[PDB]
Amino acid sequence: MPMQMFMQVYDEIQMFLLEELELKFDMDPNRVRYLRKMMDTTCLGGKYNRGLTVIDVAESLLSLSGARRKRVLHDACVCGWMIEFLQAHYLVEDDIMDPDVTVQCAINDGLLLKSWTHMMAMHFFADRPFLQDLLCRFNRVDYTTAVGQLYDVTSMFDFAEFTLSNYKRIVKYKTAYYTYLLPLVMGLIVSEALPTVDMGVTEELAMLMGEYFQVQDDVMDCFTPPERLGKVGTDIQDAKCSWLAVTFLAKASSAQVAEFKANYGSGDSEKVATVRRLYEEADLQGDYVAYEAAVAEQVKELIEKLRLCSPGFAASVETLWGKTY
Amino acid sequence: MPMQMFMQVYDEIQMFLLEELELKFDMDPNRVRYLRKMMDTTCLGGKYNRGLTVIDVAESLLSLSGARRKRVLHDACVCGWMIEFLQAHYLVEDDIMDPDVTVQCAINDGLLLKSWTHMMAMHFFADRPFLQDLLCRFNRVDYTTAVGQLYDVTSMFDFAEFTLSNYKRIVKYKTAYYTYLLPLVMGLIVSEALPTVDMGVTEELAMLMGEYFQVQDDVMDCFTPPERLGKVGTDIQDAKCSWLAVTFLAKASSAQVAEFKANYGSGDSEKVATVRRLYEEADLQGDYVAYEAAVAEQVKELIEKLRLCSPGFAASVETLWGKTY
Ligand SMILES: Cc1cccc(NCc2ccccc2)n1
Numbered sequence: 001m002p003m004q005m006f007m008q009v010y011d012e013i014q015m016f017l018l019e020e021l022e023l024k025f026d027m028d029p030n031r032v033r034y035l036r037k038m039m040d041t042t043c044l045g046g047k048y049n050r051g052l053t054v055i056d057v058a059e060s061l062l063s064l065s066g067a068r069r070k071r072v073l074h075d076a077c078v079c080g081w082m083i084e085f086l087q088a089h090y091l092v093e094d095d096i097m098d099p100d101v102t103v104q105c106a107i108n109d110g111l112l113l114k115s116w117t118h119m120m121a122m123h124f125f126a127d128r129p130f131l132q133d134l135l136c137r138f139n140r141v142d143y144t145t146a147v148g149q150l151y152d153v154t155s156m157f158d159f160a161e162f163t164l165s166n167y168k169r170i171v172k173y174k175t176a177y178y179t180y181l182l183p184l185v186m187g188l189i190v191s192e193a194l195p196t197v198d199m200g201v202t203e204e205l206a207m208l209m210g211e212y213f214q215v216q217d218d219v220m221d222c223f224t225p226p227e228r229l230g231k232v233g234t235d236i237q238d239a240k241c242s243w244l245a246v247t248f249l250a251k252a253s254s255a256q257v258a259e260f261k262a263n264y265g266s267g268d269s270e271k272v273a274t275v276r277r278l279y280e281e282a283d284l285q286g287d288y289v290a291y292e293a294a295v296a297e298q299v300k301e302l303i304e305k306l307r308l309c310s311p312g313f314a315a316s317v318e319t320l321w322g323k324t325y
Numbered sequence: 326m327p328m329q330m331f332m333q334v335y336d337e338i339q340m341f342l343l344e345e346l347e348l349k350f351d352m353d354p355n356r357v358r359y360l361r362k363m364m365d366t367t368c369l370g371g372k373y374n375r376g377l378t379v380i381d382v383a384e385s386l387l388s389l390s391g392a393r394r395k396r397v398l399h400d401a402c403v404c405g406w407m408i409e410f411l412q413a414h415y416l417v418e419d420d421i422m423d424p425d426v427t428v429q430c431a432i433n434d435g436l437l438l439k440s441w442t443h444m445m446a447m448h449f450f451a452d453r454p455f456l457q458d459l460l461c462r463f464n465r466v467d468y469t470t471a472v473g474q475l476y477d478v479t480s481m482f483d484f485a486e487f488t489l490s491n492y493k494r495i496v497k498y499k500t501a502y503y504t505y506l507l508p509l510v511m512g513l514i515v516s517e518a519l520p521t522v523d524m525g526v527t528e529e530l531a532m533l534m535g536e537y538f539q540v541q542d543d544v545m546d547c548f549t550p551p552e553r554l555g556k557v558g559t560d561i562q563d564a565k566c567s568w569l570a571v572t573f574l575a576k577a578s579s580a581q582v583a584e585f586k587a588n589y590g591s592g593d594s595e596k597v598a599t600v601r602r603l604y605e606e607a608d609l610q611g612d613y614v615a616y617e618a619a620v621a622e623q624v625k626e627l628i629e630k631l632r633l634c635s636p637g638f639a640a641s642v643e644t645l646w647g648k649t650y
Pocket residue numbers: 089090091093094145146149174175436
């Protein structure tokens with residue numbers, strides 16, 4: 001029922017965007033179908049975890065608080081696609097990083113996906129009292145992500161910044177704000193119950209879940225084979241400030257750090273294997289189970305504090321935590 | 326006085342953006358200075374025609390309608406930099422079109438410049454009643470420009486679309502909306518006199534001025550030498566849907582069109598010269614003086630119709646027209 005409604009509102013949103021281009025932007029049919037195919041390719045095909053979280057929060061604030069019900073759920077679906085289209089916008093920008101007309105189109109597709117989140121918000125929420133507060137919290141989170149990738153892209157340039165605190169800062173702004181905090185806040189906005197929750201505990205829960213999500217991602221990126229991971233892990237080659245790297249530097253010897261510096265950030269097959277050898281011989285995958293266990297305890301505790309004043313809201317955050325845990 | 330105030334508000338805006346990153350985004354000083362240098366490089370150095378137009382419209386709606394005066398002029402300066410930062414955002418995206426850390430930074434700079442227009446609007450206009458209407462008209466115009474470049478980038482792919490009507494559509498959405506219509510509308514918003522003007526005549530004036538601006542630009546791109554033009558004209562090589570190309574195809578013979586098709590869109594030095602030879606021998610630069618003269622007459626006439634209900638507003642639009650004429 002939730003997924004079936006989410007994909008149904010997608011067709012409704014796609015129809016408005018393409019008809020608006022046809023009727024108000026004088027677009028020919030050939031380009032309308034071109035943009036339909038581009039929209040389906042970039043937005044669909046994922047797990048839609050961020051978009052469905054917006055709906056799961058809204059439905060918990062309805063029965064646990066009807067013409068108001070049908071509006072809030074439909075509003076939660078548009079917000080759910082604002083994030084999915086935003087996630088599509090981020091993925092398209094990543095493909096550009098790694099008169100060529102196809103490079104111009106990829107850049108243009110990235111800016112159309114970001115603009116499409118504003119057009120679907122200005123239309124379906126045109127007469128909602130939260131349209132101004134939604135756009136500002138949405139734009140501030142998008143700004144946050146761009147600041148997050150500046151820390152990530154330049155974490156090796158200016159191994160001084162390879163610390164656990166800077167790692168938290170990178171994960172916090174690049175990932176946690178738009179993947180975990182943004183859908184929860186968006187569910188509270190369409191439910192009109194935003195000031196009914198402790199945002200402090202809410203923001204702290206989102207940062208810890210994003211940190212839990214990124215550490216597990218960094219370990220899989222290094223040890224999970226490509227056919228089981230879904231991609232080719234390139235964190236060691238890209239010289240990324242991963243959790244394995246900053247945890248290794250804290251427990252390595254003086255020589256092992258020198259052997260790490262001489263082999264990290266390279267594309268040679270044996271230098272990468274030498275980095276995995278240092279990771280393996282340092283028992284990092286033993287520390288991984290302990291680090292995440294402490295994070296899960298903090299999440300289990302912080303959900304309870306959010307429950308004394310938000311019982312139903314804590315149920316959806318608990319469901320969102322299970323998808324990450 | 327206007328330019329001296331505009332550059333003074335820039336320092337005020339830059340200080341808030343960088344301090345916000347330092348205080349609320351946990352940014353180190355090394356990156357704060359990095360972003361200050363990037364902001365000065367991308368935003369400053371131009372003529373600031375779009376940004377100063379916002380101020381020229383606001384000052385004409387104040388005396389020709391004081392604690393309200395100082396606020397409207399300061400609000401007009403922030404809006405003037407919202408467009409300049411947006412123009413900087415477009416220029417950065419153009420440089421990308423023509424683990425490389427410098428390509429990631431150029432992409433990130435482009436998204437920071439676009440996000441910075443939202444942050445300076447959400448702060449200096451936080452308690453203004455027009456913040457919601459400003460962001461929506463601003464985002465709709467940015468969406469318009471992205472649609473405008475899709476028509477431009479794909480005008481040779483899908484010479485069928487090489488028409489004077491499609492040329493108008495490209496110039497209208499890619500250039501006219503954000504260069505001419507957006508500053509005028511922004512001046513009316515900070516002056517709170519938006520519904521006091523005929524938007525129909527206003528929108529029609531902006532499209533004709535942008536069309537006047539782009540035709541003169543296309544002729545200079547082909548015939549003005551690089552040291553006198555300021556760049557290297559590459560419209561013929563890029564196979565652009567320029568005014569010269571669509572006007573040439575209408576008055577050329579059957580063989581000359583075939584000679585045009587066989588030589589357009591190439592980088593060879595003599596094929597480009599063969600295209601200029603076809604342009605010269607067709608007396609296009611004689612048609613250029615006639616086409617622009619008729620456009621200028623329509624602008625002179627449409628300014629008068631806007632004056633019967635907006636005397637002071639028509640003065641700033643007339644001043645904006647002189648900069649293009
Ligand atoms: C998949 C994903 C998520 C977050 C960020 C990201 N890339 C960095 C970026 C690109 C464009 C704009 C902002 C940030 N990719």
